[PDB]
UniProtKB/Swiss-Prot annotation:
This is High mobility group protein B1. Changing residue 18 to S: Abolishes cytokine-stimulating activity; no effect on chemoattractant activity; impaired nuclear and enhanced cytoplasmic localization, retained activity in autophagy regulation. Phosphorylated at serine residues. Phosphorylation in both NLS regions is required for cytoplasmic translocation followed by secretion. Acetylated on multiple sites upon stimulation with LPS. Acetylation on lysine residues in the nuclear localization signals (NLS 1 and NLS 2) leads to cytoplasmic localization and subsequent secretion. The modification N6-acetyllysine is found at residues 2, 39-40, 53. Belongs to the HMGB family. The modification Cysteine sulfonic acid (-SO3H) is found at residue 18. Residues 1-20 are annotated as: Cytokine-stimulating activity. The chain holds residues 89 to 165 of 215 of the full protein. It comes from the Eukaryota. It is found in: Nucleus; Cytoplasm; Secreted; Chromosome.
Length: 77
C-alpha cells in the first residue's frame, strides 16, 4: 500500500558529496570520528569550487523536479 503521496525530500547538498569524498579520506584514515569525517568533508566541500558543486546541486534538482511533481497532493508538516 505504498502511499504515492508520502514522498522523500533531498538530503544536504554536501551529503551527496560526503558519500563521494568519504572513502578517499577514510581510506587513508580508517579511524575517523563521525565528527572528523563530516568536518573535513565540510572543508573540502566548502573549498570545492562553486562550478564544481554543480553536479551535486544539479543532482538534487533532478530528484527535486520529480519530488514536487506528486507532492502537490501530499501534505506538509
Amino acid at each position: 500500500f505504498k502511499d504515492p503521496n508520502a514522498p522523500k525530500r533531498p538530503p544536504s547538498a554536501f551529503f551527496l558529496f560526503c558519500s563521494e569524498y568519504r572513502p578517499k579520506i577514510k581510506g587513508e584514515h580508517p579511524g575517523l570520528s563521525i565528527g572528523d569525517v563530516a568536518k573535513k568533508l565540510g572543508e573540502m566541500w566548502n573549498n570545492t569550487a562553486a562550478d564544481d558543486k554543480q553536479p551535486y546541486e544539479k543532482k538534487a534538482a533532478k530528484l527535486k523536479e520529480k519530488y514536487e511533481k506528486d507532492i502537490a497532493a501530499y501534505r506538509a508538516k
